[PDB]
């Protein structure tokens, strides 16, 4: 981590459910103790139904995400809609081959008609792990227990929304580098849905 | 910063006789307090009646022995299966060691065989290639225990010339037994390779700690 750089202190969650996947995050960017950006969209789209969230160095993850989006556009021009596994593999290759020079961590969420919604996590170092749900960031450490106690397979859309909202609200409550609004993207067969929740709503949970 | 070196803690001994040579070593491989293995040979037959040992960092010694054997293979290919003499092997090993002058192998190397007159010959190498022919050379841990034991019973100046192979083997075994008694890194076995005009013969003797 180079001196004077920008780090992605955040709270990232991705949960698979009955009809698809949901990716949620907070909206705070901090330099030290100063909130450099009060309203940030951390949900990065690399393909129509393949989204990601980033951690570590902001510049490195932005460059990696740009390269991944370019790669997936080439793949689509050749073979059509890629699977989430392919995007995860490209992310992993980029993160692992450059790990001695870049600090990047990625959470990838995707949907396709074959695999029906998937979550992959690539922590610092470049290893890849496929999980029914994933949490990352500085504020995730405070919700390792809660999530482990409240996740069920094949939850409905509303139950998944409530679970993500509660978990991210707790992470916001306890982590200094996290705050603002909660953003969520729902990836299903019916399309892409965007959700935003305000502090006056989730702080009362 | 990454440290590319290590230490494995062995003991080797080379002795040149009238018409034979002997290279022996303890067979214990350790990592600084723990026993990795109780039987791991470090003295290797390299062909053309040449025995080699590279004691110290085990990876470097294995690499050096591998490179020397491949070079000998190409030497046989390119020179009508000519026998490689001991002095030529010593020069090859000097070049192999000095090729890593700025990133040296962390080993002490001893080779043994017979010269062109049929007499026993032993060569010792410094880690960056400096080498010389010697009658007797002890290397590694407990060398300071092994050399005085040999000097107490042999006049290198019964004279060493008139000693037989069995007597040399017994003397090496006695010195290694004493060193095993006095040193914590020596033990678990001793392996001796003997080079004569009939070839290379192997002997093994169990030491303390099994």
């Amino acid at each position: 981590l180079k001196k004077g750089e920008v780090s992605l202190g955040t709270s990232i969650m991705a949960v698979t459910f009955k009809d698809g996947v949901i990716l949620g995050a907070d909206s705070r960017t901090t330099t030290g103790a100063y909130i450099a950006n009060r309203v940030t969209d951390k949900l990065t789209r690399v393909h129509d139904k393949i989204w990601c969230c980033r951690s570590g160095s902001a510049a490195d993850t932005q460059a990696i995400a740009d390269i991944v989006q370019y790669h997936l556009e080439l793949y689509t021009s050749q073979y059509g809609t890629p699977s989430t596994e392919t995007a995860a593999s490209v992310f992993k290759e980029l993160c692992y081959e450059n790990k001695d020079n870049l600090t990047a961590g990625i959470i990838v969420a995707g949907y396709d008609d074959k695999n029906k919604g998937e979550v992959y996590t690539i922590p610092l170092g470049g290893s890849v792990h496929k999980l029914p749900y994933a949490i990352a960031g500085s504020g995730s450490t405070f919700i390792y227990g809660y999530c482990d106690k409240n996740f069920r397979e094949n939850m409905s859309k509303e139950e998944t929304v409530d679970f993500i909202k509660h978990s991210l609200s707790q992470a916001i409550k306890w982590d200094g580098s996290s705050g603002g609004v909660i953003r969520m993207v729902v990836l299903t067969a019916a399309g892409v849905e965007r959700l935003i929740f305000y502090p006056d709503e989730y702080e009362q949970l | 910063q990454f440290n590319p070196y290590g230490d494995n803690g062995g003991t080797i001994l080379g002795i040149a006789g009238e018409d034979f040579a002997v290279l022996a070593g303890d067979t214990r491989n350790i990592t600084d307090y723990s026993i990795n293995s109780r039987y791991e040979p470090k003295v290797f037959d390299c062909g053309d009646n040449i025995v080699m040992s590279a004691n110290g960092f085990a990876a470097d010694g294995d690499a050096l022995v591998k490179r020397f054997k491949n070079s000998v293979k190409w030497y046989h290919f390119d020179h009508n299966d000519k026998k490689l003499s001991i002095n030529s092997a010593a020069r090859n090993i000097q070049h192999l060691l000095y090729g890593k002058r700025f990133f040296p192998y962390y080993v002490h190397t001893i080779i043994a065989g017979l010269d062109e007159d049929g007499k026993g010959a032993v060569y010792s190498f410094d880690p960056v290639g400096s080498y010389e022919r010697e009658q007797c050379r002890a290397g590694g841990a407990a060398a300071s225990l092994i050399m005085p034991f040999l000097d107490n019973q042999v006049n290198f100046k019964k004279p060493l010339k008139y000693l037989s192979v069995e007597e040399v083997i017994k003397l090496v075994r006695d010195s290694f037994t004493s060193a095993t008694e006095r040193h914590i890194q020596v033990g678990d076995g001793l392996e001796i390779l003997i080079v004569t005009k009939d070839g290379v013969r192997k002997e093994f003797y169990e030491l303390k700690r099994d």
């Binding site: - | 490179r67 090729g99 002058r101 700025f102 960056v128 400096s130 590694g140 300071s144």
Partner: protein
């Protein structure tokens, strides 16, 4: 174009054997590693190779330490018809027994001699290499190489690696028809000094004083040998070399 196709057609990369140098060093393709007139030296692929080498060369096993040439007194001078080179043969014992006596002076050619006075491996290796270079030059030019040319070759070579870690101080002594008898001193810092009298060792002031007391150009061969032996004895048995136009002659303890 087919080579380009091969480059993009899919184990070898991890072994790093797609590089020709790695294949040559491990003797995969042949014994070309032992065919280089200028030897190739491995360097750590990091930002600070010099600091790495210096740190790792000063840290446990006595047998894994780089052997250092004896700092014992070495003397050389030129009287009237050659060069007297004198060393003390008091070898230092260790955990070994020598089959024969060691020599502190390297015999580069039947006409050239050198002294170690530094790192033993550096002196041995590079003076053997210098002997090869001199042999090739003499084959090419059909004439004995001048001592100035040989010393200049050695100095240029050691200067190309200046600061890398080498350590060697040598005295190149020779006798040619055009030059006469000549002595040069070459150091690992690139120094190259021509001289008449050289004394390098632990105690060399005493030997230099004894020489200056009774040095003349009209010395005879026996007188010069006696003076060199006496100077070495004053410094601190004694190996002598007399260099003439026809080569060097070795005296054990004369």
């Amino acid at each position: 174009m087919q080579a380009i196709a091969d480059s993009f057609s899919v184990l070898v990369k991890e072994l790093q054997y797609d590089n020709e140098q790695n294949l040559e060093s491990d003797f995969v393709t042949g014994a070309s590693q032992f065919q280089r007139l200028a030897p190739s030296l491995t360097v750590p692929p990091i930002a600070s190779p010099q600091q790495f080498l210096r740190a790792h060369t000063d840290d446990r096993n006595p047998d894994c330490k780089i052997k250092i040439a004896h700092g014992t007194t070495t003397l050389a001078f030129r009287f009237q018809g050659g060069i007297i080179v004198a060393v003390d043969s008091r070898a230092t014992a260790g955990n070994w027994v020598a089959s024969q006596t060691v020599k502190k002076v390297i015999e580069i050619n039947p006409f050239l001699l050198g002294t170690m006075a530094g790192g033993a491996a550096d002196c041995q290796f590079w003076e053997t290499w210098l002997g090869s270079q001199c042999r090739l030059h003499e084959l090419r030019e059909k004439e004995r190489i001048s001592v100035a040319a040989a010393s200049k070759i050695l100095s240029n070579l050691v200067y190309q690696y200046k600061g890398a870690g080498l350590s060697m101080g040598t005295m190149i002594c020779g006798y040619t028809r055009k030059e006469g008898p000549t002595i040069y001193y070459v150091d690992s810092d690139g120094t190259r000094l021509k001289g008449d009298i050289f004394c390098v060792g632990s105690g060399q002031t005493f030997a230099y004083g004894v020489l200056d007391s009774n040095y003349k150009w009209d010395l005879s061969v026996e007188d010069a040998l006696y003076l060199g032996k006496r100077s070495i004895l004053a410094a601190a048995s004694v190996n002598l070399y007399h260099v003439t136009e026809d080569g060097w002659i070795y005296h054990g303890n004369h």
